[PDB]
Amino acid sequence: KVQTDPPSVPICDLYPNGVFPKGQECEYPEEKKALDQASEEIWNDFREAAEAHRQVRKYVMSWIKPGMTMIEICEKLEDCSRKLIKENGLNAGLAFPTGCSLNNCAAHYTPNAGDTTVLQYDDICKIDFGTHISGRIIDCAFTVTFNPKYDTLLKAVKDATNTGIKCAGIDVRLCDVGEAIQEVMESYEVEIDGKTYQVKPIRNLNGHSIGQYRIHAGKTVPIVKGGEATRMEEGEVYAIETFGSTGKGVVHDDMECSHYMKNFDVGHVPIRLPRTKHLLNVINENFGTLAFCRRWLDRLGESKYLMALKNLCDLGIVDPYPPLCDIKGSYTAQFEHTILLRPTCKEVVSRGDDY
Numbered sequence: 071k072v073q074t075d076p077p078s079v080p081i082c083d084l085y086p087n088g089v090f091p092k093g094q095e096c097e098y099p100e101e102k103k104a105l106d107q108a109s110e111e112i113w114n115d116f117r118e119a120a121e122a123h124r125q126v127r128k129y130v131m132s133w134i135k136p137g138m139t140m141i142e143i144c145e146k147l148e149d150c151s152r153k154l155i156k157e158n159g160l161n162a163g164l165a166f167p168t169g170c171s172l173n174n175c176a177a178h179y180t181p182n183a184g185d186t187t188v189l190q191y192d193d194i195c196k197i198d199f200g201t202h203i204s205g206r207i208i209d210c211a212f213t214v215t216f217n218p219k220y221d222t223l224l225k226a227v228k229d230a231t232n233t234g235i236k237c238a239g240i241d242v243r244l245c246d247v248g249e250a251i252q253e254v255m256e257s258y259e260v261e262i263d264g265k266t267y268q269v270k271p272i273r274n275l276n277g278h279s280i281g282q283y284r285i286h287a288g289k290t291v292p293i294v295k296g297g298e299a300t301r302m303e304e305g306e307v308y309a310i311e312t313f314g315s316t317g318k319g320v321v322h323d324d325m326e327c328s329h330y331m332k333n334f335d336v337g338h339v340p341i342r343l344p345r346t347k348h349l350l351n352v353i354n355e356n357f358g359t360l361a362f363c364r365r366w367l368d369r370l371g372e373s374k375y376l377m378a379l380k381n382l383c384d385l386g387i388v389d390p391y392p393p394l395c396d397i398k399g400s401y402t403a404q405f406e407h408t409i410l411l412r413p414t415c416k417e418v419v420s421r422g423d424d425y
């Protein structure tokens with residue numbers, strides 16, 4: 071039909087012909103048109119996931135406010151995402167947990183059960199969430215603030231992400247994208263609570279290629295100079311994300327872990343320990359190689375799983391991804407889009423009218 075007041079109509083019911091809206095198509099900085107058309111069903115799956123992402127994040131921006139708990143924020147967002155993507159096992163769903171990392175924490179925080187953290191007026195919150203259709207994943211992220219003191223820091227990082235998106239292309243060196251992002255990000259100076267800062271890229275955070283059911287397909291997109299001259303290739307899909315900070319510009323692991331994901335390269339492992347075997351079956355059935363969090367195990371009715379989960383991490387079957395934070399007192403911001411390197415053009419598939 072038409073989408074409802076608070077979104078509830080699945081994207082596939084809005085586009086009944088099964089053809090979803092294109093993102094922003096860009097020229098790069100016969101045969102290829104045929105080759106582009108041959109993968110049309112893949113691009114269409116990314117576009118369905120991207121339209122869900124656009125409609126969920128517009129909804130989130132309408133209601134996210136200080137005073138809400140982080141758990142309330144993530145559950146309200148994920149509810150909407152499950153409805154709009156028309157969650158169906160591993161065929162359509164949430165690609166990874168909702169990040170809502172605060173202040174000096176830049177990535178990989180979502181609340182676990184019992185977290186009483188409440189969003190504050192002065193917080194800078196990075197909302198990073200993913201949708202997929204048939205394993206075609208959209209990773210797209212933006213920063214929420216309520217105090218205008220952070221506006222230039224957000225503009226710096228938004229400009230740096232758009233610079234990396236403009237620089238990207240077939241046969242472009244990943245190191246050149248990094249150098250370009252850093253030049254733009256470091257051109258910004260900000261003043262927050264009477265202290266001035268030159269905005270710094272977080273040098274040990276990166277964008278990444280994306281593969282089917284594989285949020286990180288192994289190529290990294292640097293956000294500072296000095297990286298690898300490995301080239302981007304036709305048909306690849308990339309999350310172009312940049313992170314800016316007022317602190318050291320380096321993150322370390324910190325706080326409790328919430329995010330986990332099966333190692334993509336680990337095959338079947340026979341397990342006899344009963345609780346560990348059951349938890350691995352739950353993971354394989356519900357997530358496969360997609361990332362999950364502890365709240366997502368709780369919602370499936372699992373309990374007494376933390377030792378089984380530690381066991382799967384210690385075996386190397388599952389990897390933990392703890393929150394990544396700069397120094398105490400620092401402020402970090404993030405913007406990200408997913409781009410498709412199609413044969414005929416570069417498509418910023420997750421681009422909206424918002425960012």
Ligand SMILES: *C[C@@]1(O)CC[C@@H](OC(=O)NC(=O)CCl)[C@@H](OC)[C@@H]1[C@@]1(C)O[C@@H]1CC=C(C)C
Pocket residue numbers: 166167177178274275276277278285286290329330331361391
């Ligand atoms: C979650 C995240 O997308 C965060 C940004 C980036 O992290 C890093 O660059 N990390 C490091 O260098 C470790 Cl010190 C992404 O990796 C390039 C990272 C991502 C894709 O690897 C995780 C896997 C995804 C989930 C746990 C959601």
Ligand SMILES: [Co+2]
Pocket residue numbers: 198199209210211309311406
């Ligand atoms: Co992301």
Ligand SMILES: [Co+2]
Pocket residue numbers: 209277278309311406
């Ligand atoms: Co990403």
